[model samples]
Target: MIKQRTLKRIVQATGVGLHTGKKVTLTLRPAPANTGVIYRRTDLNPPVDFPADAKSVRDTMLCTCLVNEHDVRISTVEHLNAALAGLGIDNIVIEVNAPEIPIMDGSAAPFVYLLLDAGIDELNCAKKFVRIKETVRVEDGDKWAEFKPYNGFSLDFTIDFNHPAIDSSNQRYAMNFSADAFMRQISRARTFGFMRDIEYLQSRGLCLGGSFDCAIVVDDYRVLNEDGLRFEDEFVRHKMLDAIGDLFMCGHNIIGAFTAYKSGHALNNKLLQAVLAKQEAWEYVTFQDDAELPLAFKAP
Candidate 1:
């Protein structure tokens, strides 16, 4: 029953990309109703407007990338997209000068804080959603992801890294987004990387911008960060974080139940495409009532 929303005013921030090691400036400006979320590369010759969608998704190996027909691309969009979806924000124009989003704190926390600080305004248009009517699933090796009918949005995720530092004891998380609990619980959960991969990536000149300040660095048996872990199951929570962001590519909010087992960006995107490929699995819907708002759009 909530109206669509966008920023009340334009807000700007600067940070470094997680992989590119490049300092980038990001600007979020109010957009028209039904515009959805879009990424604009002002650096391009004609300026590219890449609407956030699974079809626009290019490479999903390490992070999410959005591409335009002009060959313009934007990388590492999960965090910013997560902020919008987590807050139930419907429309906004995100302007960036680089190929990647700034990996602020290696989590969506900063983006959430920025959006809240800049303020949010409701638009006249009603919000739309993708409602699951039948179950749809995808699998890659042993990892799997699925979406099924549910009254409200919910997610259950499980990650099993098998690392000595991580046991099977703390790898499952579930959340019903019917409550506005993203900021305190999910926002600060940092992205994680392994020491071996770190060395290899650094050798190959990847992840040039990653640091302990922004990521949870783990060796074979322990987390290198002095703070230990934010949450014992932060690894899985972050994966859920990525899942929510990637699903936003459906071009609208989704009302369903999602379950994933050891899924990453690629697997998550594939699951969504699978769902889209089957028309009987889901339908686009909008609420007719305006008397109630989703938890996210409500003021705390």
Candidate 2:
């Protein structure tokens, strides 16, 4: 059977929160099968638990945020969620001592490395997938995101940035997602922002920990990062990464094709909600044999 997976052992990392400017420690531990991805705020009085779910998403201003019943919040979780999705991790407990997740390198690469170091173990239970039965779409003005029935998982994304520095480069990226492909093409693509926007955000008391060290800083005419772009179309690829992470909040692996144009966190969550609300749009399925599963899911 195509089984569920979790970490083989506990792993930990320390870094600075991208929006809080506070040092934080994060720990990942193995969870029982079907537990899903959960976050524990260790700094709270009673230690609140926030399950990663589309319904729990309360804010998507700059990043994904989950707020528990008591108003306990966990922010900046997309990169790590992307890493977990890329690796096909089904169940795990994430413990953090801060309000936001550590933004190591501002990409999924560090989280990928951390998960790899912890090792992966397949659980005995069969893995569950939400298979799209029909097309489900969500839109806001000209921007939109949609899901369509497909045998394998894939993503196609297009971004439009009128800035000279961005317009000069590629703005489209598409990929048939697999573990290997995700690690090589999407994991290292860091978050990006404009200098003017960064300044404005700082004035508004946001992005307190953002810097060139954790993100690709772009100026009016060019990227300010000395090392430059990791991929010619890194910007769009990072958008794809965020989309994958956001979609995973559906609480299972998806069997479908995702297409988006100029979509962000809020829109992605709305797309998932739309798909889930329509009972005819999707169904849960499990594979009992490797050959029965989609190629994108089978172990390489």
Candidate 3:
């Protein structure tokens, strides 16, 4: 059977929040089967628990943010969420001591390394999947995101940033979802931003902790980061990473093809909302036999 998985042991790390600019500690602990991904704000007096769900998403500005009814907020969670989803981690408790998740290298690589070091533990329960049954799409002008029925998981993304720096790079990326492909191709693609938008974003209270160390800074004509791109299409690859994380907020591994064009967090969440709202669009399924699983979901 394709079984549910969690960390074998506890793991923790410390870094700076990408938006808060505050030093924070994050801890990952194994959870019982069916726990899903639960986020705990350890800094709070009583501690607030926020489950990873589409309804928990409170903001989608420059990053995905989750908020509790008490108004406690956890920010910049997409990268770590992407890592958990990629690894087929269905049950875990994420404990953070600050309002935002640490932006380690501005990609999911660090989180993937952390979980790997902790080791993966297979649970007794079969893994549940959300299988798309019908087309569900959301759009805003030329920007759009959609999920369509597919036997396996895959992503096709297109990013259209007309800036000179971005124009020089590949604008499209596609991947048939697999743990190995995610680690090698998508996890290391760092988040990027235009140099001209730094001041404007900061003035609006965003990207306060962004720097050459955590993001790819692009000028009008070139990438300002000294080490250069991890992949020629890193920009779109990172967008794909974000979309993977955002889609995982559906509370289960999704079995569907996701296609997006110039879509960001807001549009991605909208697409998920749309898909979930239509009962005819998706159904939960489980693979009790290995032979019934899709190639992308089979053990590597």
**Structure candidate 3, residue pairs in collision:** none
For residues 130-237, what per-residue lDDT tens digits would candidate 3 score against the true structure? 999999889999898899989999999998888677654489898999988999999999999888788688788878888889999988889999989898888999
Off by over 4 Å in 2: 203-205
lDDT-best of 1 and 3: 3
The order of the candidates by TM-score, greatest first, is 2, 3, 1
lDDT of every predicted structure (CA atoms): 0.82, 0.89, 0.88
The residue ranges of model 1 lying beyond 4 angstroms of the native Cα positions read: 291-300
TM-score of each: 0.93, 0.96, 0.95
The C-alpha stretches of model 3 lying farther than 4 A from their native spots are 200-206
Index of the highest-TM-score prediction: 2
- How big is the positional error of residue 292 in model 2, measured in Å on the Cα after superposition? 1.0
Q: In candidate 3, residue 167 scores what lDDT?
A: 54
Q: Per the 3 Å backbone cut-off, how many clashing residue pairs does candidate 2 have?
A: 0
Error of 3 at 205 (Å): 6.7
Per-residue accuracy of model 2 over 1-300 as CA lDDT, tens digit each = 889999999999999988888899999999999899998889887888999889988656567788888677898988899888899999999999988899888889999989998899999998999999999989999999999999999999988888676754588889998888889999999998888888898788888888888998888888999989888788888999998899998668899999999998889999999999999999999988778888787653
Error of 2 at 213 (Å): 0.6
